[PDB]
């Protein structure tokens, strides 16, 4: 039960990392595209 | 008990991903700022 709560909290952490990774990927791609267009 | 140990190991993995994401975000921002300043 505390074990399940752990896993739920871990799942929130994971969704936070997913958010982060997607933000970074968009930003790196924007920079690659800027360099290409220059 | 092995279940708890699993979750603990998973938690170490997650903290490693957090470290990674924060390193990347600082580095991408430094590049965006460099391009802006040029």
């Amino acid at each position: 039960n505390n074990l399940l709560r752990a896993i739920e909290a871990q799942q929130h952490l994971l969704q936070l990392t997913v958010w982060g990774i997607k933000q970074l990927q968009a930003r790196i791609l924007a920079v690659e595209r800027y360099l290409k267009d220059q | 008990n092995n279940l708890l140990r699993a979750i603990e190991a998973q938690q170490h993995l997650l903290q490693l991903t957090v470290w990674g994401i924060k390193q990347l975000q600082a580095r991408i921002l430094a590049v965006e700022r460099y391009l802006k300043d040029q």
């Binding site: 074990l3 909290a9 871990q10 952490l13 936070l16 958010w19 | 708890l4």
Partner: peptide
């Protein structure tokens, strides 16, 4: 990202206390 930093710390602390109670 300041809000992210804080949600990370919050769920990390919550997880570590739950692992302890287990």
């Amino acid at each position: 990202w300041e809000e992210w930093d804080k949600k990370i710390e919050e769920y990390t602390k919550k997880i570590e206390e739950l692992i302890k109670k287990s």
